[model samples]
Target: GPGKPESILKMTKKGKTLMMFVTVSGNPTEKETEEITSLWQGSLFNANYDVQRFIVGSDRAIFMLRDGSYAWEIKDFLVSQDRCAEVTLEGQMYPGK
Candidate 1:
């Protein structure tokens, strides 16, 4: 499916962040949210990757990673988890934008 609109994602990434869209297999409960956050952290704990996550209702989350290849790395990490049903790289903040 098509991801979020370019404008919203662009604005969210304005501070040099990379936005990602995640679809979870079940309801995004507190436990699931924590697990997902920890999973993202585990992938980049050594690489010093910073991330912010926001869950929307029962099935989706919006993740923002510090401007870097962490997005790509996290995508792979997220896919490994059964809970992360789908992961999509939204957009990044370009230099001159």
Candidate 2:
């Protein structure tokens, strides 16, 4: 399911950051997403703050600071019906336009 974009934006405005996490299985040989994320991070660094990537098991997690808060998410196929990822935004800062 798609998340609440407005709520996320509001959180960011309130000094919260955002993170993108991804996990892949089945085809362990595929590294397309990882490579793409690396390229994206490079471009993002040139645009604003620093971005870091980490991998564990079949999951890839990214952590970054925006304005002055912290947020993170996991990118993984929820193969099991009960599997889920919860995103938490900590701190508060006004991200202006």
Candidate 3:
């Protein structure tokens, strides 16, 4: 279990790909979810294999990002996307390690 009162981290594997899910505790509003989704959807990926998909939930948004040294893009998202009230994570998986 890699989550706190305000953040969480999830891991699931399908074949050779690993999906990393991180969600915040607030259970954000629809507006906030849209804002979050929009922010990432428009961003660029370093490679086609870097990201699989992203799932936006009622309170949390799960990103199915690739696991690797260069995968810091997604990690950066969970850490730096917001400033007022940030989203954080504690991972249960070894991201590509």
Candidate 4:
């Protein structure tokens, strides 16, 4: 119940991670990117979830959660924020699959 427009956030289990990719537009500065990714990391920690190493580009950021059940929780949190452009599920096989 954090926000509305309950778009179905994907739930997929890779080898050992629940992964999602988020892209934000407007060509955010380095500082902006740090702030945004940190927000996500904070949320994950607050929910008692562990985060894998994060990968961030100038406009896209990776959201990796150790567990899959709370995928929607982060998805909802991501979309509700300003400047969030796209959020996609990551279901690719891990190495040596």
Candidate 5:
């Protein structure tokens, strides 16, 4: 399993304050998901205010809201949009692998 959704909420809700790391894998060129919760370093953070989309390809682009005050706001931009899908797969494997 990837992780427990309830545990994530518990940590964050119990004054733990957490960050979330989300990784998505797929073949479709165009895809999107709404209101995702991510886990990072043993803590859960809310992506509710932003729509984080990872486009896979030769070069990658991680787009997120810059202001952190609005949802789906494109605040910062990363280059290498073609390599968005170049996620390394070694020891730590994902579900779709």
Candidate 6:
């Protein structure tokens, strides 16, 4: 292994890049994957916000919201989606590390 961690990121911002680091252990069905994408994108798109979601396989996912506000939105959405196991924020987010 490269000993590198996995991450998902927005390629750009007003001049910035954002990343989300995640870990997942199960697989999802194709339809479920679609739902995941729509669940994330639809909310942000409707809010007139932009975020990038990168899905891995049928399981893992990561998202980069424009900024902290949209980031929190995703947090709430994910929470409401009943998928989050923890909640707390601090520290640095990097596109790559």
**Backbone collisions counted per model:** 0, 8, 1, 0, 13, 0
**TM-score quality measure for candidate 6:** 0.50
Arranged by TM-score, best first: 4, 1, 6, 3, 2, 5
- 2-44, model 6: which lDDT tens digit per residue? 2122232223334243455332322244444456656755665
Instruction: Show the lowest summed lDDT stretch of 10 residues, model 5.
Output: 71-80
Ranking by lDDT: 4, 1, 6, 3, 2, 5
Candidate 4 to truth, TM: 0.63
- The candidate that wins on lDDT is 4
Write down the worst ten-residue block by lDDT for model 6: 1-10
Which of 3 and 5 is ahead in TM-score? 3
lDDT of 3 at 35: 64
Q: For each candidate, what is the lDDT?
A: 0.55, 0.39, 0.45, 0.57, 0.26, 0.47
Model 6 residue 92 lDDT? 61
TM-score per prediction, in order, is 0.52, 0.41, 0.50, 0.63, 0.22, 0.50
How accurate locally is residue 8 in candidate 3, as Cα lDDT from 0 to 100? 19
Q: How big is the positional error of residue 74 in model 1, measured in Å on the Cα after superposition?
A: 1.0
Q: Which segments of model 6 are wrong by more than 4 Å?
A: 1-16, 21-27, 85-97
Best by TM-score: 4
Q: Write down the RMSD of candidate 5 (Cα, Å).
A: 12.1
| Superposed model 3: Cα runs more than 4 Å off | 1-16, 25-27, 44-49, 83-97
lDDT of each residue in 30-50, candidate 5, tens digit only: 232111111211111243442
* 71 Cα displacement, candidate 5 (Å): 14
1-97 per-residue lDDT for model 4 (tens digits): 3542223222233434656676766446555457666776766566677665254776677777554455556666555673556766655542211
lDDT digits (tens) for residues 1-97 of candidate 3? 1222211122233322435555543336655556666666446343345555454564455555444332445555555653224333335534332
